[PDB]
Amino acid sequence: QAFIPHVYDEEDNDEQEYDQRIQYNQFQGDHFDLAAISYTRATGLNGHLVLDCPVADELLSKFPDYNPAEKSGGLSREFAFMRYTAVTCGPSNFYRDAYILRPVHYPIPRQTELMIVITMYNEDDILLGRTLKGVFKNIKYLESKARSSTWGKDSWKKIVVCIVSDGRTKINERAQALLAGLGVYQEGLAKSRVDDKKVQAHMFEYTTRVGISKVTDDVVKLTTEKVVPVQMLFCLKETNAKKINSHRWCFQAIGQVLDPKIVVLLDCGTQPSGRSLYELWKEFDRDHRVAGACGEITTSLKKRQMITNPLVYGQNFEYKISNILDKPTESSFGFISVLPGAFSAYRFIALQNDINGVGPLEKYFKGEFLHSSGELDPNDDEFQMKHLMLKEEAGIFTSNMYLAEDRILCFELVAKRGCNWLLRYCKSARAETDVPEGLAEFILQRRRWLNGSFFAAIYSLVHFYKVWTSSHSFGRKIFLHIEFFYQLINLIVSWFSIGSYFLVFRILTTSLGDKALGFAPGKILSVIFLWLYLASIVTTFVLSFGNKPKGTEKFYVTIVIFFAILMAYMIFAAIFMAVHSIQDIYRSGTRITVSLFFQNSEFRDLVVATSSTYALYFLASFLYFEPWHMFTSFVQYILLSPSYVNVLNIYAFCNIDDISWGTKGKSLGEAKLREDGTFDVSVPISKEQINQSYLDQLEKIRDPAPPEEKVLVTNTEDYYAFIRSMTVLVWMFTNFVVIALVLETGGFNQFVEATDLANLKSNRAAVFLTVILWTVAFMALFRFIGCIYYLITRLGREIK
Amino acid sequence: QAFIPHVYDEEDNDEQEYDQRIQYNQFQGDHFDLAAISYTRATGLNGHLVLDCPVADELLSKFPDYNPAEKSGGLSREFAFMRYTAVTCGPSNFYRDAYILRPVHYPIPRQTELMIVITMYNEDDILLGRTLKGVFKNIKYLESKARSSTWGKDSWKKIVVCIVSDGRTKINERAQALLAGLGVYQEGLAKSRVDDKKVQAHMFEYTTRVGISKVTDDVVKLTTEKVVPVQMLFCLKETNAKKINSHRWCFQAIGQVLDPKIVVLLDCGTQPSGRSLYELWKEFDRDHRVAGACGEITTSLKKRQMITNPLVYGQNFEYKISNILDKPTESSFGFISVLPGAFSAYRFIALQNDINGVGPLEKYFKGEFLHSSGELDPNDDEFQMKHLMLKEEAGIFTSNMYLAEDRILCFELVAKRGCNWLLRYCKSARAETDVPEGLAEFILQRRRWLNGSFFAAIYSLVHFYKVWTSSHSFGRKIFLHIEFFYQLINLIVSWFSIGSYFLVFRILTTSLGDKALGFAPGKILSVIFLWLYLASIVTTFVLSFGNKPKGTEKFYVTIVIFFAILMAYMIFAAIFMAVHSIQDIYRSGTRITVSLFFQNSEFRDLVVATSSTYALYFLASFLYFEPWHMFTSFVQYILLSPSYVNVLNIYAFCNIDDISWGTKGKSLGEAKLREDGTFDVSVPISKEQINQSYLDQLEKIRDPAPPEEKVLVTNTEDYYAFIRSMTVLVWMFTNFVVIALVLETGGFNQFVEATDLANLKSNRAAVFLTVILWTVAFMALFRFIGCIYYLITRLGREIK
């Protein structure tokens, strides 16, 4: 039973409200001209392959307007026929060619207000169903809105949902069946070639009146009761070219024809709220300077336990802390380092390139062409563009843009030549996504996140001067420079994370070895932990270079467990040391004052700084009315903290290069046995040709060998591997220099004596500990002030 | 002028002697039946594609027997026509099918006495010309021999030269032109397919009377004056399958049909001497127990300077020392670890497998099938064999046999179940080869040599008991066990090479830091050298995992130069320390005696052991009448010694897996524009089929998702990568454990005090130094005694 009566769940009460405002009786579509299809010969529009096929009669019968007597049920032309187009040119020339989309082909042109892009890659039908249910609920809410100048009756005409599937043979069959059930897709229409030209994309356009009632764990139920029509454009790509090509299809080609505003980017498995898209649109509408927006992203914890899934809860804590501290501060400063690709929105006009041809979209798209094998097919119609781009002189940043990905766009929007644009974060918009439960999938996901964050930070910091020419207020530029300084400090802290972790661990473990405090096993435990730590780091490097995470997952699991145990031991050691210092304070006598407590380096550094950081996090969580994550998921995040720095960072740096492409890329004759035993062959017979061939061979071998002097450009995979190797080597060198300076680990110990080394090492260790702990505490305080300011300003805006 | 009058060079005087014994007037070939070729239809023998084509008339005219009046010049059938055969089955079924080679097809069968196999892969015509000139000179010497029971008149009928070219499209064009000039190859004959069956190999058979007069640096000159006929079989493979497949063609297929004795293995670029092959044959003939033989291999130094090419001279020294010490001792014991593939010989009957199907050849060939992608084409006629082999349960050794390569054969010959076989080395046979001048090529060559040596040693040591069942004398088994013990010691020494090198360097450099001796910069230099050493090792590992040697060659060059400088500094430090110890001996007073000199640990260990090793090498070189290498090339080898251990070993272990194979491995429709604007398309029209398709989609999406439970075998590349990673990790762990034990580098220093650590570390360092130096000295003495015994026994045999 695919179709079932509409049922409202406990959390769906709000949905019912929307239904009361919507009439649901008047949903007649506009009339448009079809393409003649004899019986077959079809009159493709503008010389392109276009077919207006009829949808299955059962789907029409489901629709309320259907009448049995009528041949098509009396439905409008758009609701009756689904359109199929074959696109051969590709993103670059889609607008240049006479490719017309149905929304703009009506006798009365339709202007798009919100293009809801959805990206898909072999995703299960469950994720797509959840995403479509969220989008449909948002569209229904927008339609129900009454006292709105832009939204209300016939609002669905201003919204188009674009689903860009990457790879014709990689799409999941169940999601394809879902789309067919909605009526968008039909199997027979698709054609491989047209006029001896490869079809790059297949576009299916339909105004569907089928709504997903509910999405259980295993099945998806769709019904036609109380469903608002939705315009669906499903672009199935012939071959997979990653996500940058999909975004090129979305912006460079479809966007130009539709010319929409506030393009929304979503990902399969991301379920927006009931009013989230309205919140994003209102954020864009209130302030005209805003060019990009992001919303709060949450992790589903439906059928996942606290203890059975430590990783899920750790990720939940990370997401909550990010949304509570990082996003609000960056929004307050007006520059957000990253806008999540799973759920975000951009103003279309802001992304347009300049007349000279340089702009955010050009920077974003250059990465795809540069980061690929230099093997261009001469038959491609985009051959000229790609060849010209490759012929251009590319620097380090231009040739490594692929790491930043969407992140790059953000910077280019704020630091435009003469434009005034800002990036804003809204907490009213919420979207729920499923996090990777497995360790291998989590590592693979974090690889590109870490690489992009690092590269984007470096690129923004190097080119910080570009904001000088931007048309911003002087105070705005001053505060942007303050933010840049903070980001520089954050990058410096993050670059030395592994070395700092090792130094803190070594100092804390060795301090327990001191005979002053009464801990017997301390020395042996410290030695054992040192050996295990070194072994884990070395094995992590070897696996990151050699094997794939999916294969050797147990090694990573064991390493993570060991690091968690080590973190627990470090916490115990720090607490023991602080308690011993306090007891020594009391033992000294002469009374006690707050001054002595704040003067004791051990107690101060170890206890006060960490407690202050925790208190700041706690207060920030409370003020946002989201306090649960501080209890349920805090411990998991704390115990997984060292793993983030060690395993994920090592894997990310070892695999900076993403070499997806492989390596590189006339029959003499055919003898066929005849009826008789003789074989039909064609071999030289005449004496003349045999002699000529022999003379040719003699001449071929007589001549001397000329120098090769190839001077070939060679392949880019070597270049990217070299870049990655240099990066990892520099990282190792800097970290080891810092470690040697702090613990006198290398040959430095030779420049001191038997007794001086101990005291000097202790002093340096204490200085390093206080420096690092107070750096962390001050960064936390900075983010806390930022989020408080965000709350105050948002409340003031809401009052206004 | 391809053909020039025969000219004898200064070193060619011996050649003239041969010509005097050979009549050169009577070289009529035996008559054999040809295959009818109408005009074309050809009567292939036994249903196979065989063609007897005529050779170019000019080549016939060159031959002395040619007469202008005669239509073919009066030449014999073999000298007049060249034979071409297309082989579709492959090595396994070559004998089973009715594939007949010309030598065995004569009315009077010809029995082969010496099959001279030559292996080729995109080699320049110069190397092939040198090899063929050497082979032709050897055949001429064998023909000239008068007082020989087996050799003499008509000896060329017992010798067949087989050239197995790997890859039809990879063969160099100049070498192909050389072969065509010799008359073996013609371009038109080759056919891609026969009877809808792929042609695996193309075999060209001809009795050539063309001899290479001289091989200059740039050109090759061939003439017909004073040339003995030579039977040539040129097997050009359709696709490249590495060298194991070529050896399978040589042994499994061609050898069975020819059934020869004493198969000789040569490589392009290897030029044997004028009587070398006779020496190998006589070695096989004298003693019937001998199953394999190898000859002295030398490095050409024609146009290479002492100072301009340090690497070439270092390799020369290595080769000379090997041939003077290692080969003679192993021959004396009767078991040679490796028989060089560039120049060697095997007894054919000894290699044959047992009735049960287990034998040396089976072990050798299993590696090719196991070490490859598990993607078998069902159309291959060897599909059953490969599928059965893959279905068999393979252990670690069986699945990693590919590392040993030819080495494995050697062991299997000595430790046979009930056979008495021995491996012997003869210094009378000599062959000259060109060593790789470039560093990248040298590293690539040494990779597989080191991997094979390690794996073969491990395999032989683990399975040492297999020699118990062999039918050898009891004393022979005792001495074989002594040799196995020596090889175990050598393997243990070689496994800890990098750690031992680091320990010796650290000890020697730190000893100069002591204030007792008057060397000021010592401390700073030691610190700097430590940092540089660590950086070099880390970068070597990173490059070995990440990049290719050809790309980043400058890094390796810099590392090698630094290691050479460091070795020079270490030698200086050792000399300084020894001189200081002697001066302290004199300073102490109370006279001096030899006892004190032999009691001083510093002087003894540092000076006496190294001097003894050098003296043993010097004496061994002198006794073999090859003393020059001890002067010209000694210094280069000494300065390159650390590089061999560090760079080559690291690269070899990081690249144990040789993943040559890549990753992994119905058009919807075609719309063609007609004369009118309409497009011809085939899309569903009837309501019934549309409704049926919609219902099918509904049913497809309605059902629940079944568990995958693939449980696939997966690909072997992951397995090999895992093996390599485990190997490198174990290597690192063991070396670091040894280093930590010796220098108290890890946490061990915590278990000692401020003052005790220095003395304990000094004592441990002294013990380690004496142990390692005397181990090296005793190994040198063992090899010296072995080579002296070899000389004495060979002289006694010669007298007999």
Cβ atoms B40, A682 nearer than 8 A: yes
Q: Does B2 touch chain A (CB under 8 A)?
A: yes
> Amino acid identity of B292?
G
A727 interfaces chain B, CB cutoff of 8 Å:
no
Dist. CA B716–CA B706, nearest whole Å:
28
Tell whether A186 is within 8 A of chain B (Cβ): yes
Q: Given strand A197-198, what is the order of strands in its sheet?
A: A41-42, B679-680, B670-673, A193-194, A197-198
With b for 16 or more beta-carbon neighbours within 10 A and e for fewer, the B290-327 pattern comes to bbbbbbbbbbebeebeeeebbbbbbbbbbbbbebbbbb
- Helices A716-743 & B522-546 angle (0-180, nearest 10): 150
Q: Name which of A548, A678, A697 is nearest B181 (Cβ-Cβ).
A: A697
Phi, psi dihedral angles at B2 (to 5 degrees): -65, -40
What's the CA gap between B15 and B274, in Å, rounded? 8
Task: Name every chain B residue with its beta carbon within 8 A of the beta carbon of A180.
Answer: 693-694, 697
Of all residues in chain A, the one with the smallest CA distance to B669 is A191
Residue B507 host element (H or E): helix B497-511
Residue A34, chain B, CB below 8 Å: the answer is no
- Which amino acid is residue A660, in one-letter code? S
d(CA A313, CA A322): 14
Helix (DSSP H) and strand (DSSP E) numbers for chain A: 30, 18
Give B521→chain A minimum CA distance, Å. Answer: 12
A356 located within any domain: no
Long-range contacts of B523-530 (CB under 8 A, 24+ apart): B523/A750, B523/A751, B525/B569, B526/A747, B526/A750, B527/A746, B527/A747, B527/A748, B527/A750, B527/A751, B529/B505, B529/B566, B529/B569, B530/A746, B530/A747, B530/B506
8 Å CB contact of B191 and A669 = yes
The residues pairing with A160 across neighbouring beta strands, listed in sequence order, are: A115, A231
Of the candidates A521, A460, A515, the one whose C-alpha atom is nearest the C-alpha of residue A486 is: A460
Question: Which of A683, A702, A710, A735 has the highest number of chain B CBs within 10 A, making it the mutation to test binding with B?
Answer: A683
- Domain membership of residue B773 (yes or no) is yes
The answer to the question of residue B143 being in a domain is no
Q: With an 8 Å Cβ cutoff, is B553 touching chain A?
A: no
B549 φ/ψ angles, rounded to the nearest 5 degrees: -60, -35
* Interface residue B177 vs chain A (CB under 8 A): yes
Interface of A with B in 645-684 (CB under 8 A): 662-663, 667-674, 676-684
Q: Give start and end residues of each alpha helix (H) in B249-303.
A: 256-258, 276-286
Can you tell me the distance from the alpha carbon of A370 to that of A373, in angstroms, rounded to the nearest whole number? 8
Question: Helix, strand or coil for residue A162?
Answer: strand
**Domain stops at, among B244, B278, B308:** B244
Size of interface A-B (CB pairs under 8 A): 287
How far from chain centre, in Å, is Cα B604? 40
Q: Does A40 touch chain B (CB under 8 A)?
A: yes
Asked whether the beta carbons of residue A724 and residue B546 sit closer than 8 angstroms, the reply is yes
| CB-based contact, B737 to chain A, within 8 Å | no
The total domain count for chain B is 2
Cβ separation B40–A542 shorter than 8 A? no
3-state secondary structure A515-573: CCCCCCCHHHHHHHHHHHHHHHHHHHHHHHHHCCCCCCHHHHHHHHHHHHHHHHHHHHH
Q: Is A284 a domain residue?
A: no
Q: Are A164 and B643 in contact (CB under 8 A)?
A: no
Would the CB atoms of A750 and B683 count as touching at under 8 Å? no
Report yes or no: B792 at the A interface, CB cutoff 8 Å.
Answer: no
**Which H or E run contains B52?**
strand B50-54
Q: Which residues of B touch A218 (CB under 8 A)?
A: 704-705
Please answer whether residues A351 and A251 qualify as being in contact, where contact means their C-beta atoms are separated by less than 8 angstroms.
Answer: yes
Structure determination method: cryo-EM
CB atoms within 10 A of CB A514: 13
Amino acid at B760: L
**Rounded to whole angstroms, how far apart are CA atoms B399 and B717?**
12
Rounded to an integer, what distance in angstroms lies between the CA atom of residue B714 and that of residue B716? 7
Instruction: Give CA B446 to chain center in angstroms.
Output: 10
Q: Are B98 and B90 in contact (CB under 8 A)?
A: no
Cβ-in-10-Å burial (0-12, 13-18, 19+) of A193 comes to middle
> Is residue B232 situated within a structural domain?
yes
Phi, psi angle pair for B570, to nearest 5°: -65, -40
- The Cα–Cα gap between A369 and A402 comes to 9
Report yes or no on A153 lying in a domain: no
B258 touches B405 (CB < 8 A): no
Residue whose pair of structure tokens reads 């050239």 in the numeric block: B163
Shortest distance, CA A467 to any CA of chain B (angstroms):
38
Nearest CA in chain B to A707: B218
Listed residue (A504, A499, A545) closest to A734, CA to CA: A499
Domain membership flag for residue A152: no
A687 contacts in chain B (CB < 8 Å): 57
> What letters, b where the CB count within 10 A reaches 16 and e where it falls short, cover B150-178?
ebeeebbbbbbbbbbbbbbeebbebbbbb
Range of the domain at B104: 1-108+159-244
- Chain B residues within 8 A of A680 when measuring between CB atoms: 40-41
Q: How far apart, in Å, are the Cα atoms of A663 and each of A372, A714, B373?
A: 12, 12, 16
**How many whole angstroms separate alpha carbon A428 and alpha carbon A345?**
14
Whether A564 maps to a domain, the answer reads: yes
Distances (CA, A) of B46 to A324, B37, B211: 84, 15, 34
Residues of B in contact with A751 (CB under 8 A): 523, 527
Q: Which residues pair with B424 in a beta bridge?
A: B293
Compute CA distances B476 → A313, A605, B472, whole Å: 69, 74, 6
How many of the other CB atoms lie within 10 Å of CB of A205?
23
Q: Give Cα B78 to chain centroid, integer Å.
A: 35
**Cβ neighbours of residue B373 closer than 8 Å, sequence gap 6 or more:** B661, B665, B715, B716, B717
Could you tell me if B620 and B324 are in contact, meaning their C-beta atoms sit under 8 angstroms apart? yes
Residues 689 through 718 of chain B touching chain A, CB cutoff 8 Å: 690-691, 693-695, 697-698, 700-702, 704-705, 718
Domain boundary pick from B191, B219, B244: B244
DSSP B186-222: -TTT--SEETTEE--EEEEEEEE--EEEEE-SS-EEE
Last residue of a domain, one of B244, B274, B307: B244
| Chain A nearest CA to B720, separation (Å) | 10
Please list, residue by residue across A147-160, b when 16 or more beta carbons sit within 10 angstroms of its beta carbon and e when fewer do: eeeebeeebbbbbb
**In chain A, which among 59-78 make CB contacts under 8 A with chain B?**
59
Which among A180, A193, A219 has the least Cβ separation from residue B704? A219
